[PDB]
């Protein structure tokens, strides 16, 4: 490390896990809140919140690559194929739901939805009658279509496009009977930290087409009502990348941890400084290396989301417990 940052060990076929864990570790406001969870009574192997606390501590203090085996055991993905049969956002949810639940009743209650939860409306509009129905939905991540899309702007256009409900899937309008209708989605809110998965793996082959994403992403036009006080501009924080064919692959994540455009590549135990071009354009696709997930941060939230974490931010009770474990282990 001429980077200051420590890598995670490759201990097994955990695919995207390591890339996702670094992305979460460098969500500093989330890291701090994780450090505050009351894990003192927890059981030292069945607790996912404790096991997340353990990995973050080590990523923050260790000079050697950090292990993840207690973490995987704690949420029960211990088989060759639990990673290959899930999406990256499904793992994230498994992680953030344990943590969110542990935070209930404490001073950090609500941190996870505060950081990751946005709101959208799904609406249905009949074409031959007055009935419209609008219903809100929460999301913690967005899955974007890429097949046939030059870029993120076009994936968003596609995402909010009007879908017809005619002939065979006519819409049931209740007292109005079956009807032709149009349906679509609009954002009401976009959260501070925006997780986008790129739908590159489809039923089971990989799509390697060129798909462009920018360092700065203006999303105002996809919101139902904009706010002149807080515009929906986002800054690219992480690029999770997969290289190779459908079957079998190499996994890296590029991050700019401090949000200043000084980029770093995290390839398991190796971490190196890289160029902006290597982190962004070189993963557009179109050798067969490319992004499958992106993390953007709302510009007006960047300072808070990436607030400096210090050693004092870890309560000593938790530091003592993790130390006693290193010492029990260190006895070979």
Ligand X SMILES: *CCS(=O)(=O)Nc1ccccc1-c1ccc(C(=O)N2CCC(O)(Cn3cnc4c(cnn4C)c3=O)CC2)cc1
Q: How far is the CB of 244 from ligand X (least distance, A)?
A: 8
Q: Which stretch binds ligand X (CB under 6 A): 49-57, 105-113, 195-203, 283-291?
A: 195-203
Helices (H) and strands (E) in the chain, counts: 10, 16
The HSE-up count of residue 310 (CA atoms within 13 Å, CB side) is: 1
Quickly list H helices, the chain. 17-25, 28-35, 48-61, 69-75, 88-102, 111-116, 152-159, 276-279, 302-305, 316-330
CA distances to 9, 77, 175 from 34, rounded to whole Å, are 21, 21, 50
Q: How far is the CB of 143 from ligand X (least distance, A)?
A: 5
* Whether the Cβ atoms of residue 208 and residue 288 lie closer than 8 Å to each other: yes
**Which of 6/88 has CB closer to ligand X?**
88
In the region spanning residues 271 to 330, those forming contacts with ligand X, defined by CB under 6 A, are 292
Q: Which stretch binds ligand X (CB under 6 A): 30-38, 150-158, 241-249, 314-322?
A: 241-249
Q: How far is the CB of 202 from ligand X (least distance, A)?
A: 6
212 binds ligand X (CB under 6 A): no
**Which of 93/186 has CB closer to ligand X?**
93
Q: How far is the CB of 50 from ligand X (least distance, A)?
A: 26
CB atoms near residue 133 (< 10 Å): 14
> CA–CA separation, 120 vs 122, rounded Å?
7
Sign (positive/negative) of CA torsion 82, 84, 90, 96?
Answer: positive
Of residues 18, 197, 283, 290, which one binds ligand X by CB under 6 A? 197
> CA–CA separation, 239 vs 266, rounded Å?
10
Q: Which stretch binds ligand X (CB under 6 A): 31-39, 68-76, 81-89, 257-265?
A: 81-89
**Which of 84/188 has CB closer to ligand X?**
84
CB atoms near residue 297 (< 10 Å): 23
**Token couple for 8:** 């995670």
Q: How far is the CB of 288 from ligand X (least distance, A)?
A: 12
How many chain residues touch ligand X (CB under 6 A)?
19
* Whether the Cβ atoms of residue 289 and residue 249 lie closer than 8 Å to each other: no
Here's the x/- map for ligand X, 139-168, by CB under 6 A: it reads as ----x-------------------------
Known catalytic membership, residue 250: yes
Of residues 78, 84, 138, 164, which one binds ligand X by CB under 6 A? 84
Known catalytic membership, residue 15: yes
**Token couple for 126:** 């009949």
184 binds ligand X (CB under 6 A): no
Give residues in contact with ligand X (CB under 6 A).
13, 15-16, 83-84, 87-88, 143, 197, 199-202, 204, 242, 247-249, 292
Residues that are catalytic: 15, 250
């Amino acid at each position: 490390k001429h980077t200051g940052y420590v890598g995670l060990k490759n201990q097994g076929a955990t695919c995207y896990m390591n890339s996702l864990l670094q992305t979460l570790f460098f969500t500093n406001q989330l890291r701090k809140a994780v450090y505050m969870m009351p894990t003192e009574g927890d059981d030292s192997s069945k607790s996912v919140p404790l096991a997340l606390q353990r990995v973050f501590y080590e990523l923050q203090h260790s000079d050697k690559p950090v292990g993840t085996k207690k973490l995987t055991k704690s949420f029960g993905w211990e088989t060759l194929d639990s990673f290959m049969q899930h999406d990256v956002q499904e793992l994230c949810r498994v992680l953030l739901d344990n943590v969110e639940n542990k935070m209930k009743g404490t001073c950090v209650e609500g941190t996870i939805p505060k950081l990751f939860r946005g709101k959208m409306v799904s609406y249905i509009q009949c074409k031959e009658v007055d009935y419209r129905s609008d219903r809100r939905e929460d999301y913690y991540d967005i899955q974007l279509s890429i097949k046939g899309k030059k870029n993120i702007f076009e994936s968003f256009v596609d995402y909010v496009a009007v879908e017809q409900l005619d002939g065979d899937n006519k819409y049931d309008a209740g007292e109005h009977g079956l009807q032709e209708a149009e349906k679509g989605v609009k954002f009401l809110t976009l959260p501070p930290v925006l997780h986008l998965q790129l739908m590159r793996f489809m039923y089971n082959i990989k799509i390697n087409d060129r798909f462009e994403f920018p360092e700065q992403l203006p999303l105002d036009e996809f919101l139902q009502k904009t706010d002149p006080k807080d515009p929906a501009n986002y800054i690219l924080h992480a690029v999770l990348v997969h290289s190779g064919d459908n079957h079998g692959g190499h996994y890296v994540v590029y991050l700019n941890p401090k949000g200043d455009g000084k980029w770093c590549k995290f390839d398991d135990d190796v971490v190196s400084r890289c160029t902006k071009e290597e982190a962004i354009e070189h993963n557009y696709g179109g050798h067969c290396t490319n992004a499958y997930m992106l993390v953007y941060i709302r510009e007006s939230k960047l300072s808070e989301v990436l607030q400096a974490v210090t050693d004092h931010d870890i309560p000593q009770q938790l530091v003592e417990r993790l130390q006693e474990e290193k010492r029990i282990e260190a006895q070979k």
